[PDB]
Structures are given as structure tokens and as C-alpha cells.
């Protein structure tokens, strides 16, 4: 309900989590094709934390078959590649990040990802998002 886009082969939709509702705006350009894409992702929010040690926990399910848990480090403090790894709690972040992926085959079905951001220094959750990809 928060946001969604329809691509040629994918339908991507996100909503807020249930135990954390901290506002965040996020979108992409163009709508991701699971057949390989190249583009940008636009982020706009106000850090509920220091963003200096930011990482993610992803709980992924492919057709109701829980994958293991992934942990992706985005910032680590020592000369990060990103300008928003310098923000502070209360300082509006508004940025655009490029990406590209091609060469993987994904099954048809229905995926789900619970994506929760953690401030690694004090271990509090900045936000939680509830994703939904439908690949056709």
C-alpha cells in the first residue's frame, strides 16, 4: 500500500512493518525487471539513528520456502563510498543511488522480503519494510 510499480515481468509492492512504523520514502527508476536492470533508487527520510554503522537484515521467502538470513553492510564508518553515511539523527537525507544486476535466473512465483535496517553501533532498528515481488 505504501508504494508499488509494474514492470514488464515483475510487480513490486512495499508496505510498512508491524512493530516499527518510522516514515521513509523510497522508489526506483525504472521499475525493476527481474530479467536484469540498470538504474537508480531514490531515498528520502529523516534518520532515526546515526547512519554511520548501517546494515540490513533480510528475511527472504521464495514460494513459502524460507531462505537463510542475509546481512548486507552498507556503511562501516571508514571512508564509505556514500555521502549519506555521514548523516545524523534529525538531518534530512535525500539521495539517489545507482545499481545494475544481470545474469541470474529467478523462478516464477511469489517472493517476500522483510527488510530491517539496523544502526550497528547501538543495535536499534531504524525502520522495517515489508516487500512483495510477483514474477510472472
Binding site residues, another protein, CB under 8 A: 46, 62, 65, 67-68, 78-79, 81-84, 86, 88-92, 95-98, 103-105, 107
Largest CA distance in the chain: 41
State the cell numbers at 100: 545494475
Task: Give min distance, CB of 22 to ligand NAG, in A.
Answer: 14
Is residue 13 at the binding interface for ligand NAG, with CB under 6 A as the rule?
no
Q: Which of 22, 120, 130, 134 binds ligand NAG (CB under 6 A)?
A: 130
Contact 46, 53 (CB under 8 A): no
String of DSSP letters for 35-57: T-EEEEEEEEE--SS--SSEEEE
Is residue 2 at the binding interface for ligand NAG, with CB under 6 A as the rule?
no
Look at residue 18 and give the partner it binds from another protein, ligand NAG, none, a contact being a CB closer than 5 to 8 Å depending on partner kind: ligand NAG
Q: Is 87 exposed, middle or buried (0-12, 13-18, 19+ CB in 10 A)?
A: buried
Size of residue set near ligand NAG by CB under 6 A: 7
Amino acid at each position: 500500500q505504501q508504494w508499488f510499480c509494474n514492470s514488464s515481468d515483475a510487480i513490486i509492492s512495499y508496505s510498512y512493518c508491524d512493530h516499527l512504523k518510522f516514515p521513509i520514502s523510497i522508489s526506483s527508476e525504472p521499475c525493476i525487471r527481474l530479467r536484469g536492470t540498470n538504474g537508480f533508487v531514490h531515498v528520502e527520510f529523516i534518520p532515526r539513528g546515526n547512519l554511520k554503522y548501517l546494515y540490513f537484515n533480510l528475511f527472504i521467502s521464495v514460494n513459502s520456502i524460507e531462505l537463510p538470513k542475509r546481512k548486507e553492510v552498507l556503511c562501516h564508518g571508514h571512508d564509505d563510498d556514500y555521502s549519506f553515511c555521514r548523516a545524523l539523527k534529525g538531518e534530512t537525507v535525500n539521495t539517489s543511488i545507482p545499481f545494475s544486476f544481470e545474469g541470474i535466473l529467478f523462478p516464477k512465483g511469489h517472493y517476500r522480503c522483510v527488510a530491517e535496517a539496523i544502526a550497528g553501533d547501538t543495535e536499534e532498528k531504524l525502520f522495517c519494510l515489508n516487500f512483495t515481488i510477483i514474477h510472472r
